[PDB]
């Protein structure tokens, strides 16, 4: 009920307040008549969830920003009707993957699936409903460097792979059959361009892509070798 205080110059009165504030003198003054306006300026469910979530993101070594985006997300979902279940494992993984997305970081469905057993398809449905709720409350490329890390590849290899991913997506032809296959194949091409051996089975194991898949991607990718060359 009212209670809002406004500062106005009784001698000026011309405008609303147009003033400056002097922190050192700790006083506030009308900039016009130079009058001092003021003086002596002074200088249960949830907690359990965020606990286990905390543990999960921690083991995942995700930076606190991601952790906190997921926390925020989860609070919004919380107890709502439409969720109607999922036992608290699905929600924690969903909210996590969200906070990853929203944080511009990328994590594969498989990776989170390695931290938690969500049964997969059930996970997709929960993730979609949560996504819908966020809209109501109103991009593979990042994966490419992360994979190099796993292989410990030189920088030039990584950037080559980035050019390769953009070029491959534009040329279409299979649309990608999920991004993961394209990211790994793009690498496999780029590395085979260079002399550095990973061979094949080692990358298929290490990065968990079916060897047949990498070779299959390789043939079509090989066909378009013409236009993928950065220099």
């Amino acid at each position: 009920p009212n209670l809002n205080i406004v500062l106005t110059c009784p001698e000026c009165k011309v405008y609303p307040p147009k003033i400056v504030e002097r922190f050192s003198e700790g006083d506030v003054v009308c900039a016009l008549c130079g009058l001092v306006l003021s003086d002596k300026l002074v200088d249960n469910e949830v907690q359990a969830a965020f606990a286990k979530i905390t543990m999960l993101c921690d083991a995942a070594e995700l930076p606190k920003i991601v952790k906190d985006c997921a926390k925020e997300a989860y609070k919004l979902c919380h107890d709502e009707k439409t969720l109607k279940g999922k036992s608290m494992e699905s929600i924690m993984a969903a909210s996590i993957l969200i906070g990853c997305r929203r944080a511009e970081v990328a994590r594969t469905f498989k990776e989170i699936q390695s931290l938690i057993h969500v049964k997969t398809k059930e996970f997709g449905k929960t993730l979609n409903i949560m996504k819908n709720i966020l809209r109501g409350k109103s991009q593979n490329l990042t994966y490419i460097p992360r994979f190099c890390s796993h292989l410990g590849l030189p920088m030039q290899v990584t950037t080559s792979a980035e050019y390769t991913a953009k070029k491959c997506k534009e040329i279409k032809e299979i649309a990608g059959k999920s991004p993961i296959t394209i990211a790994v194949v793009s690498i496999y091409l780029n590395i085979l361009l260079f002399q550095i051996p990973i061979t094949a089975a080692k990358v298929g194991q290490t990065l968990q892509v079916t060897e047949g898949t990498i070779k299959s991607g390789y043939k079509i990718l090989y066909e378009h070798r013409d236009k993928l060359v950065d220099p």
């Binding site: 070594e61 498989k110 390695s114 796993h150 410990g152 590849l153």
Partner: protein
């Protein structure tokens, strides 16, 4: 003594975090009614 792993360090970290690799080992994986009666 203690042995220092000399690798590119990327491979070791990939195995550390979420690796997209799971399982591969198992530990704590955890007469009718008339005549009948």
């Amino acid at each position: 003594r203690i042995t220092t792993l000399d690798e590119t360090v990327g491979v070791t970290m990939s195995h550390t975090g979420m690796s997209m690799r799971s399982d591969n080992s198992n530990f704590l994986k955890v007469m009718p009614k008339k005549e009948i009666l």
